[PDB]
Design a protein around this nucleic acid. Structure first.
Lengths: 51, 132, 184, 38, 42, 205, 174, 66
DNA sequence: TCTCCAGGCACGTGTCAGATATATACAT
DNA sequence: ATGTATATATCTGACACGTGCCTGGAGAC
């Protein structure tokens, strides 16, 4: 299956090791993936069923 | 001032693992070679490629011979027989050297004095790699 | 007298198509300077008893044990590759008195002493009846051999320089070899 | 007493390991010779 | 100053030791910045 | 090419031949690399030469000159040092001659001294002894040795006299010779002159 | 300046023993015309945080997770067995910075980062950078490459040995 | 000048026989080789060194060859 | 709840850090 | 006249590793 970024639905190149969300470029890792609240991850990964 | 990576010690074991299809055209006859090196206050187990083992068996080493694997160029030197075993039962005008001090894996500093013409010659006619 | 080098050349031998004139004159200079080297060799003479030779399937790898004896001393040994290659030549039949030079690697069969009765009649062997040697099996000896500087230059020049001793394929040996040979 | 006694009052080299597996053998004795092949 | 005129008489190797003699390896290989260890030619 | 330029291992040849049915004719070609002239010429890495180690110090050269005839005489020899690393590299010289040697100093454990003296006094095959000046030169029974080698033991004549008396004791059944090696034109000349004037001062009074 | 060839030979430079005078002059002429090609390649350059490699008893299959970071972002990568074989070769430890060519597997260690407890700063920006490299080359370099009698080493050992003209019309037409 | 002792002729029977005490871990422990020779008004079988059989295998020698 | 074996606890021996001592020439 | 400098030489002194063992954590129902 093709990997995709969970923030934008784009093509995912990088997966963050702290919380296991794939992302496309640097700035979504800066102001979305890093400062996200705990518990947002579980229905963030519910779309692809990775929880 | 050149640093060198040196694996030296007395060869304890020498066990090559074979390939699944040795006559497949491509690939090597063997997969890896397990070498057990033991020096003073240290003992290491070495898993090699075929390529370093070609140079190692080019020197005709065996069990009980101390070797000197220079990891810079892959060149190896048969240091001699060990004097932990017997001495007076050889016909091969051999020389006997004790166990190398320190651990097996080493990083030592050697001060070399070369010229630029030697660099030009060594790059013009390349020798000392482990290639064809 | 002997043991002193004497290089006698004509004038026309300097001009060559493989060598420059200075290279030919440097070789003629270095052929005339001699190095006398002493060496400590061991002579092993005895009636051989059991020869065990272990060779691989292709015949490349060779190892084995050599059991030799004299009147007063029995001693087994271990064989290298060149030792087995020298023993394969001049066929030993386990009872011929041989003599081995340790530092020269020379194998000399002196003769047969056991006088074997049952023999396969395939060889034309008429080996001389020598006696089994007595006394010390291993004897130390100091020898001297003379070599000149050009020979050491050609030997240290490349991988197969000992053939270049005789073929003359020593093409313009570099100056680094010559100064390192002078230092050594 | 044992501590006081302990504190007061208390060859031929081996040969090289010969190894030969999967290796054809030639024996040469006084009366017979052998050629063990594979 | 006593440490340097007495054992120069005994042996020159008491100050600096004779190291291994090898050609200069004109090579950029994989070195280490420090139940077996893999040794691959690089 | 790489299989041409080297050999297959023997156990690998056995596994391919009889455990896989591959005949000898269909083996890959092997062992086409030429033999070198010596075992010395097989590689360009040269180890530190032991002969260059011993010949660069002339005191060790004279010691090895006398030690051959000392071993041919069937003798027992003591050598006294002052410096500990010269007391550590003499084993590198003795392994070249494969002589039977023991080492004794004050850094060693105390209970090794008693059975070291015991195997000195019973085992006759031991040849070489390494000692410190104040460790083995004080009151130790060395009655079966006569030749004491003073490598650099000239720093104080009292310790030299004590080391002499440690070996030159009662019960010796033969003659005693003491050799003292030194180099000329050095600071050892003035140091030995100071030791000689201290010896004359001690001998007069 | 740069990017334009400048051959500087003397009058005595062409009297060779293995190359004719016209051959040496043709090589000196074709050494002084450049071909400028701009090509783009993706590269991964960053600071390695931690390498975890697990293997079986016989080492039939090797699974590896490599976490790698920049000053701006970090990621975890799952590696196949070939890239594990390319990482234990040319040993990469924690705190080292490397550049990875994903297509060719060329991993070069640029050194160590600022973690002592050589030295080179941690790379910034995006991990996967699209670099366009402007390559320049001489026609004499392509002549020995397209000629099959000698390899590229004749550019370095100087043993091209009288390149024929039929390859020269081919490289001119190309 | 040299004197050469030679054997030549057709191969009528060639078999290497095992020794009376076969060594363990090996197959075909040969003690000697019996090779029969046949020429014009001449026929002789003879004993042989066991190492010659390796050269026999190297030479591809069978019955009917010279 | 039955089984069972090796993980952690307990008790020995070697191995690098401090302390006194020689010691003699040089500099203050 | 005296500190000292820099290596000894002994020489203890506090600390980490190589064997027993037993019992409780893990596999199975």
């Amino acid at each position: 299956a093709k990997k995709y970024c969970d923030v934008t639905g784009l093509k995912g190149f990088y997966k963050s090791p702290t919380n296991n969300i794939r992302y496309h470029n640097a700035e979504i890792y800066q102001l979305i993936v890093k400062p996200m609240a705990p518990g947002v991850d579980q229905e963030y990964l519910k779309l692809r069923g990775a929880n | 001032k050149e640093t060198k990576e040196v694996y030296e010690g007395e060869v304890t074991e020498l066990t090559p693992e074979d390939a699944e299809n040795p006559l497949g055209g491509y690939g090597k006859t063997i997969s890896h070679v397990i070498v057990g090196l033991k020096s003073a206050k240290g003992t290491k187990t070495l898993r090699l490629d075929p390529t370093i083992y070609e140079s190692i068996q080019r020197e005709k080493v065996s069990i009980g011979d101390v070797i000197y694997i220079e990891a810079n160029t892959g060149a190896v030197k048969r240091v001699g027989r060990s004097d932990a075993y017997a001495t007076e039962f050889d016909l091969e005008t051999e020389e006997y050297v004790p166990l190398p001090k320190g651990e097996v894996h080493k990083k030592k500093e050697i001060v070399q004095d070369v010229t630029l013409h030697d660099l030009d010659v060594a790059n013009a006619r390349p020798q000392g790699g482990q290639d064809v | 007298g002997k043991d002193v080098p004497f290089t006698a050349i004509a004038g026309s031998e300097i001009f060559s198509l493989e060598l420059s004139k200075t290279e030919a004159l440097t070789q003629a200079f270095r052929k005339s300077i001699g190095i006398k080297i002493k060496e400590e060799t061991e002579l092993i003479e005895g009636e051989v008893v059991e020869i065990q030779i272990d060779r691989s399937i292709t015949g490349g790898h060779k190892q084995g044990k050599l059991t030799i004896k004299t009147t007063d001393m029995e001693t087994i040994y271990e064989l290298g590759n060149k030792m087995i290659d020298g023993l394969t030549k001049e066929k030993v039949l386990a009872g011929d008195v041989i003599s081995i030079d340790k530092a020269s690697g020379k194998i000399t069969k002196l003769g047969r002493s056991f006088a074997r009765s049952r023999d396969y009649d395939a060889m034309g062997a008429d080996t001389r009846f020598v006696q089994c040697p007595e006394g010390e099996l291993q004897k130390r000896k100091t020898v001297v051999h003379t070599v000149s500087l050009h020979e050491i230059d050609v030997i240290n020049s490349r991988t197969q320089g000992f053939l270049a001793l005789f073929t003359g394929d020593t093409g313009e040996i570099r100056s680094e070899v010559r100064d390192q040979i002078n230092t050594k | 007493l044992l501590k006081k006694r302990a504190g007061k009052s208390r060859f031929v080299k081996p040969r090289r390991p010969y190894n030969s597996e999967g290796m054809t053998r030639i024996l040469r004795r006084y009366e017979e010779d052998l050629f063990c092949t594979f | 100053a006593v440490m340097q005129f007495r054992k120069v008489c005994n042996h020159p190797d008491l100050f600096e030791r004779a190291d291994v003699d090898s050609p200069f390896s004109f090579t950029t290989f994989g070195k280490t910045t420090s139940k077996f260890t893999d040794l691959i030619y690089s | 090419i790489s299989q041409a330029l080297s050999d297959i291992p023997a156990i690998t040849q056995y596994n391919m031949h009889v455990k896989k049915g591959i005949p000898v004719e269909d083996f890959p070609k092997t062992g086409l690399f030429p033999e070198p002239l010596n075992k010395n010429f097989s590689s360009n890495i040269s180890m530190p030469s032991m002969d260059r180690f011993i010949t660069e110090s002339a005191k060790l050269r004279k010691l090895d000159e006398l030690l051959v005839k000392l071993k041919s005489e069937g003798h027992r020899v003591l050598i006294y040092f002052q410096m500990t690393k010269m007391m550590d590299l003499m084993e590198e010289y003795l392994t070249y001659r494969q002589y039977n040697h023991i080492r004794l100093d004050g850094s060693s454990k105390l209970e090794d001294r008693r059975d070291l003296v015991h195997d000195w006094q019973t085992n006759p095959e031991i040849f070489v002894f390494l000692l410190s000046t104040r460790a083995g030169g004080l009151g130790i029974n060395l009655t079966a040795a006569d030749t004491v080698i003073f490598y650099d033991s000239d720093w104080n004549p009292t310790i030299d006299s004590q080391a002499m008396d440690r070996a030159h004791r009662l019960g010796q059944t033969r003659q005693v010779t003491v050799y003292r090696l030194l180099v000329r034109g050095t600071i050892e000349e003035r140091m030995r002159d100071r030791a000689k004037q201290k010896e004359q001062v001690q001998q007069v009074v």
